[PDB]
Design a protein around this ligand. Structure first.
Ligand code: FMN
Ligand code: QLA
Length: 354
């Protein structure tokens, strides 16, 4: 390991002992990365791993998934940290508070995290002011993950507003398919509402000066039939997107939630409650299988981004061999620190030389 074991074994465990709350440590690390207090890494360090996706040059297929830099405050330091691309988001049109706190819980025994943030964003305008000048030009790729407000009348209008707001400055845009977890934003959980959403979104996209790539991020909990329906609408000529992201988080069970403090919810006695989404190593097996399914349904027509449970190099290689062109992580960055960006890259380069 070397300088990598210093975080996974010495720095981060002591930090978790000091900052017991997960979201507090999240705010602190974002505060540090916004000012540059973060180990930098040299680009062009992996010549055999450079790739071209959506016509964009990537230093390596490894990037930071959405939800970490929700407001675009520290994407520059994270690009310098080792990630080849940062997915700013999820950003809502109006500034949103999100669900009640605590909403983030560590499951260190399995290197996992259970969260129920609920799209806490600073709004379109605040995040757009941090991305307008494109300061990352030539230093990496930046995508924007668009969302809708909780009190929104027409959620598809919120996604269209996001496409029009960030379509000129972002390298790519992402829209989250509503997970079959709760009625919260599940008004678009049918095949025709998705086709309607993609139709309006692509119309707004075509109104831009450049045909900015539109990606669709799905949940690993979709059954076989709904998974096929999502792929069909995503590939139809009238509503053809540019790529997909597989996947998001999995609905946590009661036993998995009580092991990390996600359950019970203070002030909630009902059993039909969503404790949160499970990310980390327990997600890798399911999210990869879902990716392997989608890659077969699309026949490899559109690029895919494998996300979920990547903790070492062979995990990312499994996703890349399954049909993914890019890979993203989040939870392993919590448990392994900044070196996790180049660590996985090193291991991939060692596995290809055989
Ligand atoms: C605390 C937290 C917040 C997240 N916020 C978002 C988000 O706002 N938008 C989104 O598309 N995914 C969000 N995610 C999901 C991640 O982007 C990613 O899909 C998932 O965590 C991948 O699993 P992994 O971290 O184990 O690799 C969030 C995940 C966590 C743990
Ligand atoms: O975002 C989180 C975070 O920044 C943590 N610490 C951390 C991570 C990397 C780093 F380089 C320095 C400190 C957390 O413990 C955490 C826990 C649960 C959810 C999110 C985070």
């Amino acid at each position: 390991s070397g300088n990598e074991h210093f975080y996974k074994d010495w720095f981060l465990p002591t930090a978790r002992l000091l900052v017991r709350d997960g979201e507090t440590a999240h705010n602190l690390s974002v505060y540090l990365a916004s000012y540059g207090f973060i180990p930098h890494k040299q680009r062009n360090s992996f010549p055999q791993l450079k790739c071209k996706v959506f016509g964009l040059e990537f230093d390596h297929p490894i990037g930071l998934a959405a939800g970490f830099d929700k407001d675009g405050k520290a994407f520059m330091g994270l690009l310098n940290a080792g990630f080849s691309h940062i997915e700013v988001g999820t950003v809502t049109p109006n500034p949103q508070l999100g669900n009640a706190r605590p909403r983030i819980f560590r499951w260190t025994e399995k290197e996992a995290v259970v969260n129920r943030c609920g799209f806490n964003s600073d709004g379109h305008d605040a995040v757009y002011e941090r991305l307008k000048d494109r300061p990352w030009e030539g230093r990496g790729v930046i995508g924007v993950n668009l969302g809708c407000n909780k009190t929104s009348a027409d959620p598809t209008a919120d996604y269209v507003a996001g496409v029009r707001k960030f379509g000129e400055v972002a390298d790519y845009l992402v829209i989250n398919v509503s997970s079959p977890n709760t009625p919260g934003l599940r008004s678009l959980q049918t095949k025709e509402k998705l086709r309607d959403l993609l139709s309006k979104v692509l119309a707004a996209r075509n109104q831009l000066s450049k045909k900015t790539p539109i990606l669709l991020k799905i949940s690993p909990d979709e059954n076989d039939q709904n998974l096929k329906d999502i792929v069909e609408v995503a590939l139809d000529s009238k509503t053809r997107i540019d790529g997909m992201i597989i996947s998001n988080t999995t609905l946590t069970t009661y036993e998995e939630a009580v092991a990390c403090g996600a359950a019970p919810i203070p002030g909630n006695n009902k059993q039909n409650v969503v404790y949160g989404g499970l990310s980390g190593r327990p997600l890798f097996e399911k999210s990869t299988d879902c990716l392997r399914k989608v890659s077969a349904l699309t026949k490899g027509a559109i690029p895919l981004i494998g996300v979920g449970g990547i903790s070492c190099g062979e995990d990312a290689l499994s996703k890349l061999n399954a049909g993914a062109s890019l890979v993203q992580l989040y939870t392993s960055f919590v448990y392994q620190g900044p070196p996790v960006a180049h660590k996985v890259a090193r291991e991939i380069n060692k596995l290809k030389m055989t």
